[PDB]
Amino acid sequence: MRGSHHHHHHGSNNNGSLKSAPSSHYTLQLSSSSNYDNLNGWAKKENLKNYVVYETTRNGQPWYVLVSGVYASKEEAKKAVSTLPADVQAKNPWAKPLRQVQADLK
Protein backbone atom coordinates (compact mmCIF):
# COMPACT_ATOMS: atom_id res chain seq x y z
CA MET A 1 0.00 0.00 0.00
CA ARG A 2 2.33 2.72 1.28
CA GLY A 3 6.06 2.03 0.96
CA SER A 4 7.41 -0.96 -0.95
CA HIS A 5 11.16 -1.51 -1.21
CA HIS A 6 13.01 -4.39 0.45
CA HIS A 7 16.62 -3.53 1.27
CA HIS A 8 19.49 -5.77 0.18
CA HIS A 9 19.53 -9.21 1.80
CA HIS A 10 21.43 -11.50 -0.56
CA GLY A 11 23.69 -10.85 -3.56
CA SER A 12 25.98 -13.40 -1.91
CA ASN A 13 28.43 -15.66 -3.74
CA ASN A 14 31.07 -17.25 -1.52
CA ASN A 15 29.42 -20.52 -0.49
CA GLY A 16 30.76 -23.29 -2.72
CA SER A 17 27.29 -24.80 -2.43
CA LEU A 18 26.71 -23.47 -5.95
CA LYS A 19 28.92 -25.70 -8.09
CA SER A 20 27.80 -28.41 -5.67
CA ALA A 21 24.89 -29.04 -8.04
CA PRO A 22 24.53 -30.01 -11.76
CA SER A 23 23.65 -26.75 -13.53
CA SER A 24 23.82 -28.46 -16.92
CA HIS A 25 20.26 -29.47 -16.03
CA TYR A 26 17.40 -27.20 -17.16
CA THR A 27 13.73 -26.88 -16.24
CA LEU A 28 11.14 -24.97 -18.26
CA GLN A 29 7.74 -23.88 -16.92
CA LEU A 30 4.22 -25.09 -17.68
CA SER A 31 2.55 -21.84 -16.66
CA SER A 32 2.40 -19.03 -14.09
CA SER A 33 0.01 -17.30 -11.70
CA SER A 34 -0.42 -15.84 -8.20
CA ASN A 35 -2.93 -18.12 -6.49
CA TYR A 36 -2.59 -21.64 -5.10
CA ASP A 37 -6.32 -22.36 -4.87
CA ASN A 38 -7.00 -21.04 -8.37
CA LEU A 39 -3.94 -22.90 -9.66
CA ASN A 40 -5.13 -26.26 -8.32
CA GLY A 41 -7.99 -25.80 -10.78
CA TRP A 42 -5.82 -25.47 -13.89
CA ALA A 43 -3.17 -28.00 -12.87
CA LYS A 44 -6.03 -30.45 -12.32
CA LYS A 45 -7.84 -29.22 -15.43
CA GLU A 46 -5.11 -29.83 -18.01
CA ASN A 47 -4.40 -32.94 -15.95
CA LEU A 48 -0.68 -32.21 -15.67
CA LYS A 49 0.89 -35.65 -15.31
CA ASN A 50 4.00 -36.15 -13.17
CA TYR A 51 4.27 -32.89 -11.22
CA VAL A 52 4.70 -31.49 -7.71
CA VAL A 53 3.33 -28.20 -6.38
CA TYR A 54 5.85 -26.28 -4.27
CA GLU A 55 6.88 -22.76 -3.23
CA THR A 56 9.56 -20.69 -4.96
CA THR A 57 10.53 -17.15 -6.02
CA ARG A 58 9.35 -15.08 -8.98
CA ASN A 59 9.79 -11.31 -9.13
CA GLY A 60 9.94 -10.59 -5.39
CA GLN A 61 6.60 -12.41 -5.26
CA PRO A 62 6.48 -16.13 -4.23
CA TRP A 63 4.48 -18.38 -6.56
CA TYR A 64 3.61 -22.06 -7.01
CA VAL A 65 5.42 -22.95 -10.24
CA LEU A 66 4.98 -26.39 -11.80
CA VAL A 67 7.71 -28.36 -13.58
CA SER A 68 8.13 -31.91 -14.91
CA GLY A 69 11.28 -33.66 -13.70
CA VAL A 70 14.35 -32.13 -15.36
CA TYR A 71 15.63 -32.01 -18.94
CA ALA A 72 19.22 -33.13 -19.55
CA SER A 73 20.19 -29.86 -21.27
CA LYS A 74 18.74 -27.07 -23.41
CA GLU A 75 18.93 -29.29 -26.49
CA GLU A 76 16.06 -31.54 -25.38
CA ALA A 77 14.38 -28.67 -23.54
CA LYS A 78 13.43 -26.89 -26.76
CA LYS A 79 11.86 -30.03 -28.22
CA ALA A 80 10.23 -30.82 -24.88
CA VAL A 81 7.91 -27.91 -25.63
CA SER A 82 6.43 -29.61 -28.70
CA THR A 83 5.36 -32.47 -26.43
CA LEU A 84 3.39 -30.03 -24.28
CA PRO A 85 -0.13 -29.14 -25.61
CA ALA A 86 -1.28 -25.73 -26.83
CA ASP A 87 -2.73 -24.63 -23.49
CA VAL A 88 0.75 -25.04 -22.00
CA GLN A 89 2.56 -23.75 -25.09
CA ALA A 90 0.26 -20.72 -25.09
CA LYS A 91 2.05 -19.60 -21.92
CA ASN A 92 5.27 -19.42 -23.93
CA PRO A 93 7.37 -21.50 -21.48
CA TRP A 94 10.21 -19.04 -20.89
CA ALA A 95 13.48 -20.91 -20.33
CA LYS A 96 14.32 -21.10 -16.62
CA PRO A 97 17.85 -22.48 -15.94
CA LEU A 98 17.70 -24.84 -12.97
CA ARG A 99 20.67 -22.80 -11.75
CA GLN A 100 18.18 -20.04 -10.93
CA VAL A 101 15.78 -21.76 -8.53
CA GLN A 102 19.02 -22.35 -6.63
CA ALA A 103 17.85 -19.26 -4.75
CA ASP A 104 15.31 -20.92 -2.47
CA LEU A 105 17.55 -23.97 -2.20
CA LYS A 106 20.63 -23.64 0.02
Side-chain half-sphere of 92: how many Cα atoms within 13 Å?
A: 1
Instruction: Residue 65: give its domain's CATH number.
Output: 3.30.70.1070
Show the domain range for 9: 1-106
- The distance between the two most distant Cα atoms of the chain, rounded to a whole number of Å, is 46
CA–CA separation, 103 and 17 (whole Å): 11
SS3 annotation, 2-71:
CCCCCCCCCCCCCCCCCCCCCCCCECCCCCCCCCHHHHHHHHHHHHCCCCCCCCECCCCCCECCCCCCCE
- Name which of 104, 75, 105, 79 is nearest 93 in CA terms: 79
Domain count, the chain: 1
CA–CA separation, 106 and 103 (whole Å): 7
Please provide the distance, in angstroms rounded to a whole number, between the alpha carbons at the two ends of the chain.
31
93 contact partners, CB below 8 Å, separation of at least 6? 28, 29, 30, 81, 84
- DSSP character for 73? S
